[PDB]
Write a protein that binds this ligand. Sequence first.
Ligand SMILES: OC[C@H]1O[C@@H](O[C@H]2[C@H](O)[C@@H](O)[C@H](O)O[C@@H]2CO)[C@H](O)[C@@H](O)[C@H]1O
Ligand SMILES: OC[C@H]1O[C@@H](O[C@H]2[C@H](O)[C@@H](O)[C@H](O)O[C@@H]2CO)[C@H](O)[C@@H](O)[C@H]1O
Ligand SMILES: OC[C@H]1O[C@@H](O[C@H]2[C@H](O)[C@@H](O)[C@H](O)O[C@@H]2CO)[C@H](O)[C@@H](O)[C@H]1O
Lengths: 146, 146
Amino acid sequence: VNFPNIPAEGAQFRLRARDTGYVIYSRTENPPLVWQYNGPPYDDQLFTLIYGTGPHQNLYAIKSVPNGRVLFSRTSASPHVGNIAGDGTYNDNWFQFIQDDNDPNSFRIYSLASDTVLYSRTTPDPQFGNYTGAKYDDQLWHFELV
Amino acid sequence: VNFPNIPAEGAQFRLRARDTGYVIYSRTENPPLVWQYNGPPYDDQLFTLIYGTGPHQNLYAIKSVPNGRVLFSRTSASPHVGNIAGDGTYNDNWFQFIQDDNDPNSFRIYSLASDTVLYSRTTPDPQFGNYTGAKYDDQLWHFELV
Ligand SMILES: OC[C@H]1O[C@@H](O[C@H]2[C@H](O)[C@@H](O)[C@H](O)O[C@@H]2CO)[C@H](O)[C@@H](O)[C@H]1O
Ligand SMILES: OC[C@H]1O[C@@H](O[C@H]2[C@H](O)[C@@H](O)[C@H](O)O[C@@H]2CO)[C@H](O)[C@@H](O)[C@H]1O
Ligand SMILES: OC[C@H]1O[C@@H](O[C@H]2[C@H](O)[C@@H](O)[C@H](O)O[C@@H]2CO)[C@H](O)[C@@H](O)[C@H]1O
């Protein structure tokens, strides 16, 4: 089931992991360019959604407020999770927000392209990335409107 | 996780429900044109897959062997589940085969367009159709290669 509370197109938000409380950032300098962060609110943690239409219906691109790049999640090459210019040129720029079946207030950030979800954990390494497999709590996210 | 054993493109198969053991048919006369069936093998129970490309990656159109129509699964009009010509012209002609997280040998037939899965049950009515909500075993299917 699609997450029922997806931010309106163009509305800005942070993506915060339910359990770690860490947020995703997407920046242009100092790798990793996309990772998780536990610290002050900064602009590179701010995103908006591009609403998919046509074959992208019920999918979304996740666009950085300060730099305009969209997220990608892939398994073809490292890094698995990163950013790229544009507004969803590539298939792995498109995400589904899938409501958790036990906690209706959180969702997974799912890639149809790579059949992965994003995760945030404190251990083991890598502490942030994407994953194909069972439904763990460390895959659960919130939208945090700003 | 996508079902790991999706029939090769162009290979033929029946779609059989795990619990009821009923098969899907897709025909051109005598409504319902797409429904479930408990009886002898007939050609209108035979399907092949069109493999989704580009924005349809990891999605599939389910095409009838004898009549060539593709399945649809929608919530926009009645009937919810049916067939149509055009080799996947409409978004609701595209399906993801999602492995069950407890039974690795079955999958759900999921519509990204309508956020529904196909189900098969003996009761209550409607006995066959689509559904958005919790996971139930009557949503689970097998590919039966011919
Ligand atoms: O949407 C991501 C997109 O990335 C492309 O590869 C990029 C790569 O991420 C970057 O490090 C490099 O400098 O430029 C490449 C542009 O081709 C992939 O080709 C594409 O499939 C997607 O994965
Ligand atoms: O992919 C299905 C497609 O159906 C269209 O509606 C059909 C309808 O199913 C049929 O009974 C009628 O005779 O013709 C209609 C138009 O082709 C929908 O318009 C479309 O959105 C899809 O749902
Ligand atoms: O996987 C199907 C699921 O269906 C639920 O029943 C639905 C029913 O199909 C629909 O016609 C009605 O409007 O809503 C019902 C409740 O959501 C069953 O409750 C469930 O057990 C499954 O059979």
